[PDB]
Design a protein around this ligand. Structure first.
Ligand code: MH0
Ligand code: MH0
Ligand SMILES: C[C@H](O)[C@H](O)[C@H]1CNc2nc(N)[nH]c(=O)c2N1
Ligand SMILES: C[C@H](O)[C@H](O)[C@H]1CNc2nc(N)[nH]c(=O)c2N1
Lengths: 405, 405
């Protein structure tokens, strides 16, 4: 069967068949969260999940590998009977990570899905070994500002009481402090409190990089400071407004999300931080202009000398645009990979067209793929989308501090 | 029971209970369309629909009217047994129209829901009487540019073969012609063809107001030209860019949608055109800047002397903003009611807060309530919403030319 979807700009029609392979405006709906266990994954659930994955994998090549396909089926089964689980071949993992990314309905850069570097840290055992792996990560991805997509996969959930887990929301992330006002990133107020509760030394700034809070093999969490030589940053200049530097703003160059779970073949890797690179509006519009974060918009408004007291003047529409201009300009001047949202949007549309011919669909969350400024000016606004959870997948998780033992 | 929803800006939480009273990114999903019948509405369906409505109605006052409530229950029933349907008291209709509007999940102006003027034309019998009613409408609403919300309700669907139906998508709407290119509003190309097929005289302009194509008591459709004295328009001036007038643009002042069905109390009024007033971005961003309509954006780009050949320059973000500035400025100069999207957004948020205390919910379609430019700058972006179909309701319908008999 299938579902007809229309792009209202080009008038083009597309038929979705891929949604049949799905599973069972809210930001964190339960359907997108994968929570804790306290007992291993039942064998009858696990086995056909594994068999299906192994078939996806061996079903991806141009030349079938029916011998090793058949061999890997038996091998995987025998392993599950004898050990109660299994381990993925390195190529399987690589394939899983790119696939899960391919299946991230809230991501706009998925034209890049087969261009990812994978770090196998499935043999990590302690917090300090995590912290070293994360440091290798931050350094590989950052590449002196020529950002590279990478993921570090840590040991899979086994029984569920030995979970490896980054407590951070992103690898680099500015601290936010309540004050004697709020200084820094107000979004990380509660998490900053947590770092302080665990002995981290607050420096009370607007751009103080938070510490990695790591938990290995179910252990209690240990606090690590990131070597500032590793954290690359971009100071904000506007290419015509000389006064923009006086706002004294910067942002980190590495958008690396830390707290999501990779589901694959019946397995769960609750620690698999990954990174892409920035799309300007994340910093320009969300980080700098959300009232709940930094909230510069009224100030850039006042310094442009606009009528910031009458909404019908569209001064907000003029301010934010220049801020976006600041960010894109500052990233290019200092050689840090970035993409403006117009370009990203056209890129995604190309991807979708490629994904529909290749496999008859592309899961997509309109509410996320449309930029937070200039919606209908981008082509993604006009494209109808179906949103569905396939496998593998990157799920959200419950905040570990609400469930630590 | 209930559902928890978060506003991520204020951090405020709201509990939705109203969704329990619901019924059974795609623009026209079937769940939002109410199509044709060929036999009357079965009595067993109709009766509890009517009883429920009558209870909603008599349940709305501060002082109960239990006698007339009870009386109206019997009266309505007796009428349905004897006549196979019923007729609403004028106050019932008024109440129904405002309620259905209150229940329009894709509308942003609903703080105005109890401020509507109702024209009872349920006794219309012929096309010419429709056309006169529509003319009274256009004239009342337009009010010399001080726009007033109004609706004209025509006779309810009875058997389903005598349906009253406006074939227009809106009352005022510019024509679009294929050319020896495309001139005018490309969105109304197919409908313009239809008007021409029925004898209307094409004038081949960019802003030629289309004719009302009316169908009464199931009859074939008759074509009427709207008296230009009734169609009020705003010519576009930019208050700093002298060259904006040379684009030679204007738009009509009356946004009046013609083709939706009012469902109420088991009844269907397939002809009930209504109007509000404009929110700038409809004209500024959609009508003028959608590639599929008018598509001025590259031209205003070139005349601003911006680098319209490099997307990372954000020239699209600068152009569109000024166009929005043109529209808002031209409507105010010429005394035509209009509202900018920042203001509308704050207005809706106030409404939602009022709707949740008053009746524990507000149906809402995020994908529609968020303006097509400057999403996260408006508060509506950050508010989680639940979208559900209540009753009464304004449904979409199937294009009548695909089903005319
Ligand atoms: C393999 C993992 C992965 C990689 C690599 C990846 C690479 C990239 N991404 Fe992107 N992307 C990935 C998976 C996601 C997820 C799962 C989400 C949504 C997560 C969430 O709920 O916050 C996401 N990406 C979300 C986003 C968002 C929006 C985030 C937000 O607004 O909060 C952007 C702009 C984005 N991406 C762009 C990009 C770009 C550009 C690249 C590089 C080409
Ligand atoms: C009682 C009927 C009704 C009235 C009166 C009404 C009055 C108003 N409205 Fe609004 N509104 C109504 C019911 C709707 C519907 C049913 C829709 C969506 C219809 C559709 O699918 O195209 C809608 N309104 C849609 C809209 C839209 C978006 C339309 C689009 O993008 O295509 C806007 C901007 C809007 N309104 C604003 C307003 C304003 C401002 C007022 C005046 C206060
Ligand atoms: C409430 C609403 O879902 C929320 O604000 C969403 C909107 N769409 C988004 N889209 C992206 N890319 N990132 C976000 O954080 C959000 N937030
Ligand atoms: C495909 C997508 O649903 C479509 O472009 C929608 C998006 N949201 C909208 N919102 C409004 N107000 N009006 C519209 O026409 C649309 N179109």
């Amino acid at each position: 069967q299938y579902v007809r979807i229309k792009n209202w700009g080009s008038g083009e029609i597309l038929h979705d068949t891929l949604h049949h392979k799905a599973t069972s405006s809210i930001m964190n709906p339960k359907s997108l969260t994968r929570g804790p266990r306290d007992k291993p994954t039942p064998l009858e659930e696990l086995l056909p999940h594994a068999i299906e994955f192994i078939n996806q994998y061996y079903g991806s090549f141009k030349e079938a590998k029916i011998e090793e396909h058949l061999a890997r089926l038996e091998a995987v089964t025998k392993e599950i009977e004898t050990t109660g689980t299994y381990q993925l071949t390195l190529d399987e993992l690589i394939f899983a990570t790119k696939m899960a990314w391919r299946n991230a309905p809230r991501c706009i850069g998925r034209i890049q899905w087969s261009n990812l570097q994978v770090f196998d840290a499935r043999n990590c055992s302690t917090a300090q070994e995590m912290f070293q792996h994360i440091c290798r990560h931050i350094l590989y991805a950052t590449n002196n500002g020529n950002i590279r997509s990478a993921i570090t996969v840590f040991p899979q959930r086994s029984d569920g009481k030995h979970d490896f887990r980054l407590w951070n929301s992103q690898l680099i992330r500015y601290a936010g402090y309540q004050m004697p006002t709020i200084r820094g990133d107000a979004a990380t107020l509660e998490f900053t409190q947590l770092c302080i509760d665990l002995g981290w030394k607050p420096r009370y700034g607007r751009f103080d990089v938070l510490p990695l809070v790591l938990q290995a093999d179910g252990q209690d969490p240990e606090v690590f400071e990131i070597p500032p030589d590793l954290v690359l940053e971009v100071t904000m200049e506007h290419p015509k407004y000389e006064w923009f530097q006086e706002l004294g703003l910067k942002w980190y160059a590495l958008p690396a999300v830390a707290n999501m779970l990779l589901e694959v073949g019946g397995l769960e890797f609750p620690a698999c931080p990954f990174n892409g690179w920035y799309m300007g509006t994340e910093i320009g519009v969300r980080d700098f202009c959300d009232t709940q974060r930094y909230n510069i918009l009224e100030e850039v408004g006042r310094r442009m000398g606009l009528e910031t007291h009458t909404l019908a003047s569209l001064w907000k529409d003029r301010a934010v645009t220049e801020i976006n201009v600041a960010v894109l300009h500052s990233f290019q001047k200092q050689n840090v990979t970035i993409m403006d949202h117009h370009t990203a949007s056209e890129s995604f549309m190309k991807h979708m067209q490629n994904e529909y011919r290749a496999r008859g669909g592309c899961p997509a969350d309109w509410i996320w793929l449309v930029p937070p400024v200039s919606g209908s000016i981008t082509p993604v606004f006009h494209q109808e989308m179906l949103n569905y959870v396939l496998s593998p997948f990157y799920y959200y998780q419950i905040e570990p501090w609400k469930t630590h033992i």
